């Protein structure tokens, strides 16, 4: 509520009024690492502050305790704080021990001012009502859901705070019931941080092709589990592409172009073979069931039907005969309807410059996600491991630059290897039937397997989780159920547990489903004495000990908040 979209520009002006000083650094941007959206958002923010000369300190943070450690050691000279990708769910005054009495300067007249501004760039739609309403210091960059949906909770909270027998109980318990109905609600995303920051850049006037491409990457990175967000934000990106494109031509070494062209829903089409692109795609294995041998037979049969030889299909896309790849849209239109792959046809954004080849938005965001993942006494191991993924995040930041395409090709190769590992472990799960039905949720526990040291990473376990949700979503015989995905780390000796939401099949076209695992995780942590970690910014990511795993799952299946 404190910043609607039409005054994002005003908020940026306030940042200048606290940070446009050549002598000292006064702006520190806390970025949630291990998120593509926050990475692109901070890249656009860093370009904007570089063009206007604002001093900055970009700090990547993994855990909530890491946030508290970094905020506790901050100097008092810093007056502007930007929280990218997080800070929209928890109460920041109750977490960062913030009291407004020692941070207030020049209160005199009903005006209040503070010596530090903390801005929140968060996409998680459960918004803390104290944080968004009763807080002057914590300033939210709201998408606009407060003006449409959160009005009843606004008046309930305001008459709760204003009024500190049957009338008092009858109104106060009703407003607290409304507030507790808004609370204990699942977590969802309907807007991207990159779209909000590009709206800020449109309000200022610093938009160009690079910021538009970063906005395209940030919007495209949410297409895996939040396809309604991408389908909503696609026409604005189409309007911006057709606005900032030039008039027209011959391929020349300096002309960067960014076209809206058919970019099919495939894993790494332009940097791998067509056989490996269909074989490692989540949607193709989701529909044709490629995990068993019959699916591979059907894939070879449709290669026979499409007229593409397996010698030509297994050849690299750049070296592929273009009698196959020029009329590939016509072949896709004629042949994919019989096998159910009609939804492969999809228009996306493809950027190229010079003579170095074309890259799509989807291939670029899988390359960036791979560079986040495997880009490079137990508490020291956790600290070193958190430092390792912070180094991975900065390597992926280095890959965002135009002059560092070798990092991009390294990310492409890492994405290929990681998708091979994900495919092997996915068919490992599916062949031996470790998926167990618990009547309210589906349980998948990895005890041992091939290269299990990749799954101490969060996004690799989320990649396996989205693989399983896509593979099980097209099977209509089992209905929509939430998924618990646990992976064991022997050296740390902890089960890292991820909560995965189900989704409808991609061909259908409604209300998005929520993430009800954080409420149960918090309630079990409060009621039981489980030594667990809640510090991840995605609240469905927890770490349990091995010996406390089965009581945690029994208390999870006893609880009805799934």
């Amino acid at each position: 509520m404190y910043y609607g979209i039409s005054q994002f520009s005003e908020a940026y002006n306030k940042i200048l009024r606290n940070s446009s000083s050549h002598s000292s650094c006064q702006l520190v941007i806390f970025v949630s690492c291990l998120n593509i959206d926050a990475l692109c958002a901070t890249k656009m923010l860093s370009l904007l502050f570089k063009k206007q000369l604002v001093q900055s300190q970009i700090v990547p943070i993994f855990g909530y305790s890491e946030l508290r450690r970094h905020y506790s050691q901050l100097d008092d000279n810093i007056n502007s704080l930007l929280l990218v990708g997080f800070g929209g769910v928890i109460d920041l005054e109750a977490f960062l021990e913030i009291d407004p009495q020692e941070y207030v300067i020049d209160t005199d007249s009903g005006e209040q001012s503070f010596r530090r501004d903390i801005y929140v760039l968060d996409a998680h739609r459960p918004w803390n009502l104290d944080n968004i309403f009763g807080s002057q210091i914590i300033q939210c960059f709201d998408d606009g859901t407060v003006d449409d949906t959160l009005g009843e909770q606004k008046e309930a909270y305001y008459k709760l705070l204003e009024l500190d027998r049957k009338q008092r109980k009858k109104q106060i318990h009703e407003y607290e019931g409304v507030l507790e109905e808004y609370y204990s609600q699942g977590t969802t995303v309907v807007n991207s941080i990159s779209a909000q920051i590009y709206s800020l850049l449109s309000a200022i006037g610093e938009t160009n092709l690079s910021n538009l491409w970063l906005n395209i990457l940030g919007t495209t990175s949410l297409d895996i589990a939040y396809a309604q967000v991408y389908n909503r934000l696609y026409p604005l990106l189409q309007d911006e592409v057709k606005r900032l494109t030039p008039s027209s031509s011959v391929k020349t070494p300096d002309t960067l172009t960014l076209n809206i062209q058919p970019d099919y829903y495939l894993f790494l089409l332009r940097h791998s073979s067509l056989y490996d692109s269909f074989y490692y795609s989540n949607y193709v294995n989701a529909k044709l069931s490629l995990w068993n041998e019959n699916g591979k037979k059907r894939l070879h049969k449709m290669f026979a039907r499409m007229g593409i030889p397996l010698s030509t299909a297994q050849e690299t896309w750049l070296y592929m005969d273009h009698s196959i790849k020029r009329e590939l849209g016509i072949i896709f239109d004629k042949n994919l309807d019989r096998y159910g792959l009609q939804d492969i046809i999809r228009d996306g954004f493809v950027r190229t410059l010079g003579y170095r080849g074309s890259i799509s938005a989807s291939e670029f965001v899988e390359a960036l996600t791979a560079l986040l993942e495997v880009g490079n006494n137990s508490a020291q191991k956790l600290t070193n491991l958190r430092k390792r993924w912070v180094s991975n995040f900065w390597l992926s930041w280095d890959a965002l630059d135009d002059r560092k395409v070798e990092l991009l090709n390294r990310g492409i190769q890492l994405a290929q290897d990681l998708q091979r590992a994900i495919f092997n472990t996915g068919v490992a799960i599916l062949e031996k039937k470790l998926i167990k039905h618990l009547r309210i949720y589906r349980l998948c526990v990895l005890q041992d397997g091939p290269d299990l040291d990749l799954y101490r990473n969060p996004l690799t376990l989320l990649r396996l989780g989205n693989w399983l949700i896509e593979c099980c979503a097209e099977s209509e015989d089992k209905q929509l159920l939430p998924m618990v995905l646990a992976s064991i780390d022997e050296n740390t000796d902890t089960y890292l547990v991820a909560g995965l939401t189900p989704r409808y099949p991609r061909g259908l076209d409604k209300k998005p489903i929520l993430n009800n695992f954080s409420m149960a995780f918090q309630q079990i942590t409060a009621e039981t004495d489980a030594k667990v970690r809640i510090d991840n910014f995605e609240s469905s990511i927890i770490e349990i000990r091995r010996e406390d795993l089965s009581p945690f799952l029994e208390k999870l299946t006893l609880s009805g908040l799934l």
């Binding site: 449109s202 200022i204 006037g205 309007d239 057709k242 606005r243 030039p246 008039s247 027209s248």
Partner: protein, 424 residues
């Protein structure tokens, strides 16, 4: 018969592309992009520090724009839909539909600090204020071109039964004085292949641009590629239109005498002795969306004949005689303009008096170079007529020395008689 078209200053046609520039001037450029039956309008500014550029989604299909230092006025010609947007976003934008008859289109719009001016194809002239209150409904000859700078408004009218004309006014917050009302305009309309016909179907008048100078003198750029400045417009009995750039001739002059077609001048503004304009290269007159840096073209008085420049050059190098002639004429007209603007409107900076003194210096130096060529041909009477127009007493002694070098003692006696007249 004749068809009217909506005009904005230095606008570009669509052509084969899907985008065009609505207006281009010294403040900035406003361009529109076709966006699948709607439009996206981007307003960019040449002054980054004062104004921040913006863009918006236009659903009405605006084909008219006017851009000044305090607002932006968009106008749809077919439906009468106009909109005023202040730059500071403190005053609110306003949107108004004016009454249009059948066959009536808004041909041109203009904005003033305290007024907003809309002109229609049947000759109506509707003036609002800056906030949307109507103020006047005048009927004039059909306005096909408007450009306002501060409180001064300059317009061009054309009709079959009236002919081409111009009107200049200064409305102000007070002292409402109209300088000239529908006096005839000395400009050549174009001689009505597809590279020119794509533009002349869009802009039949041949107005490439219409603006004011940096000191407030009106300037127009017709289809003959000459920049006409109105001199002494404050006094209506002494007003005259001075051509100060026949830009085809200087295009031919920088190309080494080659009859050059593929380069054109697209005018934007006139600073003192310099037209800022994009030299557009290609078969199309209008520039495209990757807008290059606007080049600078110094104004030259059109006294250059191509025959003599081809005769002496057996880069076109002008001989010192006609170079002195054009420097003398250009210095005289610029001295008159600077003297009028400094005496009437005052100096807006501190530089105007010293540049006027240096301009009179360059005036006298060119007059002495004409005096030398007169004395080289034993022409006493032409030398006396040249040094009779010599302004300052400092440079008359140089003419005495040239008379000594040319051995014309009667010229010495008459110049000393001129000095005797000049001591009192």
């Amino acid at each position: 018969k004749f068809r009217y078209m909506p005009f904005s200053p230095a606008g570009t046609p669509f052509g084969f592309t899907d985008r065009r520039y609505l207006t281009m001037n010294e403040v900035g450029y406003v361009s529109t992009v076709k966006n699948s039956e709607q439009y996206s309008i981007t307003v960019s500014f040449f002054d980054v520090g004062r104004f921040r550029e913006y863009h918006f989604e236009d659903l009405f299909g605006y084909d008219l724009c006017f851009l000044n230092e305090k607002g932006t006025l968009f106008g749809q010609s077919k439906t009468g839909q106009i909109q005023y947007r202040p730059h500071d976003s403190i005053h609110s934008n306003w949107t108004k539909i004016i009454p249009l008859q059948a066959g009536e289109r808004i041909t041109s719009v203009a904005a003033t600090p305290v007024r907003v001016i809309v002109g229609t194809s049947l000759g109506y002239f509707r003036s609002f204020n800056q906030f949307g209150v109507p103020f006047a409904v005048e009927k004039t000859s059909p306005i096909v071109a408007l450009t306002a700078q501060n409180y001064r408004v300059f317009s061009v009218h054309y009709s079959q039964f009236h002919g081409l004309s111009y009107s200049l006014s200064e409305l102000g917050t007070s002292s409402k004085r109209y300088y000239k009302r529908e006096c005839p305009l000395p400009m050549s309309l174009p001689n009505i292949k597809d590279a020119n016909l794509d533009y002349y179907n869009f802009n039949p008048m041949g107005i490439k641009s219409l603006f004011f100078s940096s000191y407030g003198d009106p300037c127009i750029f017709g289809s003959d590629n000459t920049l006409l400045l109105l001199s002494k417009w404050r006094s209506p009995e002494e007003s005259k239109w001075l051509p100060i750039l026949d830009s085809n001739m200087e295009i031919w002059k920088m190309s080494g005498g080659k009859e050059t077609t593929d380069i054109h001048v697209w005018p934007l503004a006139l600073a003192y002795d310099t037209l800022n304009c994009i030299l557009v290269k290609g078969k199309h007159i209008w520039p495209e969306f990757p807008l290059p840096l606007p080049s600078e073209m110094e104004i030259r008085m059109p006294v250059f004949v191509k025959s003599k420049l081809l005769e002496e050059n057996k880069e076109i190098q002008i001989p010192v005689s006609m170079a002195a002639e054009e420097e003398y004429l250009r210095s005289k007209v610029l001295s008159e303009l600077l003297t009028d603007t400094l005496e009437n409107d005052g100096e807006m900076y501190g530089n105007e008096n010293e540049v006027l003194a240096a301009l009179n210096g360059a005036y006298d130096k060119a007059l002495l170079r004409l005096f030398a060529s007169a004395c080289s041909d034993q022409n006493v009477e032409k030398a006396l007529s040249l040094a009779h127009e010599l302004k300052q007493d400092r440079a008359l002694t140089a003419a005495v020395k040239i008379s000594e070098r040319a051995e014309l003692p009667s010229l010495v006696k008459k110049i000393n008689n001129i000095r005797e007249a000049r001591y009192e």
